[PDB]
Amino acid sequence: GSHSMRYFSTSVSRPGRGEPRFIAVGYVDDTQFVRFDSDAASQRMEPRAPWIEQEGPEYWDEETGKVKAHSQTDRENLRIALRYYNQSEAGSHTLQMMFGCDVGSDGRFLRGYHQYAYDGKDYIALKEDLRSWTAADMAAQITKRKWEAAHVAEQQRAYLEGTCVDGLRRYLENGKETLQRTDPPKTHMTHHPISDHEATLRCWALGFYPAEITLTWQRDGEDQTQDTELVETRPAGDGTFQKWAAVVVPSGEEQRYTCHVQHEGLPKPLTLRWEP
């Protein structure tokens, strides 16, 4: 199937408490592989997946250089955002950045991304064509014009269609055991009386990778979102994911209810029913 590489960066100002904190984190699909934290002693980009330890030592020096340049740049971008929004130096603010590339199962470039958020709101994003920018407000329109004038879309396109995909494909090979695995969910159903009169049926998907999954309830084979609870997909901490979906049911009518599990690792959707 398709694969994604994503770098996520967070810069947080803390006036009177030193320079902003910069955290960067790198992912391939739902698996983290690097970090950098300007507060940590190493002052190095660090591995967070076994397979990235195969990169040579030159890699660690190069990524450390570049993430430090990102750092110094987003520290200044916090001060530029202050000016544009006309805000005091007394308050803490957040600049988030995301970028990276998608490839098909053939390994060909699919899609490129490069976007910012200020104080948790969309600021600017590179559009699908990788030739143009969406700006959320007049401050981002200042950035949009600067970046058009300086051909920023062209520099970022050449990275996303080039080095980015090269990197993602090398990672997919060096970490094939991890990244290209497909762990189907292990599913079961639990039953929890609420009363003499009603019970919760809970449908479980455990140990699955990657994290994309769909859990659906039906009653007599028609979709059910009434009395349905669906929790966020959640990490187990071992590189796999968990999810459940629940219905409260008239006790003695359990068998009307089917749970349906869709996941890349199942050759076919699963139907679960209540089995004493």
Binding site: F8, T10, V12, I23, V25, Y27, Q32, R35, D37, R48, S92, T94, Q96, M98, A117, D119, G120, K121, D122, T190, H192, R202, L206, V231, E232, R234, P235, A236, G237, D238, Q242, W244
Partner: protein, 100 residues
């Protein structure tokens, strides 16, 4: 400026079996800004040797962290996650339910 209040899930890595070594997870997600305090509690007191993931965020820019520790569930030992954020008047405690 957006502010988003954390969502909290407390759960075991593996199906709880009383007296078998497991991991206790607290997943805090959907929050903004990023400053957050998380404690894992056994019977109301702080666990010392808790670890967390590196700060990342979702499509909507909202942050997520996993906090975890090795633990051995019993029938009677009560575990919880205590979360403090600028959006909360006071810490939110979510008790671990082995069935959730």
């Amino acid at each position: 400026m957006i502010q988003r209040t954390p969502k909290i899930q407390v759960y075991s890595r593996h199906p709880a079996e009383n007296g078998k070594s497991n991991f206790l997870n607290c997943y805090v997600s959907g929050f903004h800004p990023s400053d957050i305090e998380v404690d894992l509690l056994k019977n109301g007191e702080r666990i010392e040797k808790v670890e967390h993931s590196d700060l990342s965020f979702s499509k909507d820019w909202s942050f997520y962290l996993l906090y975890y520790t090795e633990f051995t569930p019993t029938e009677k030992d009560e575990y919880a996650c205590r979360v403090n954020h600028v959006t909360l008047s006071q810490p939110k405690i979510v008790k671990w339910d082995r069935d959730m």
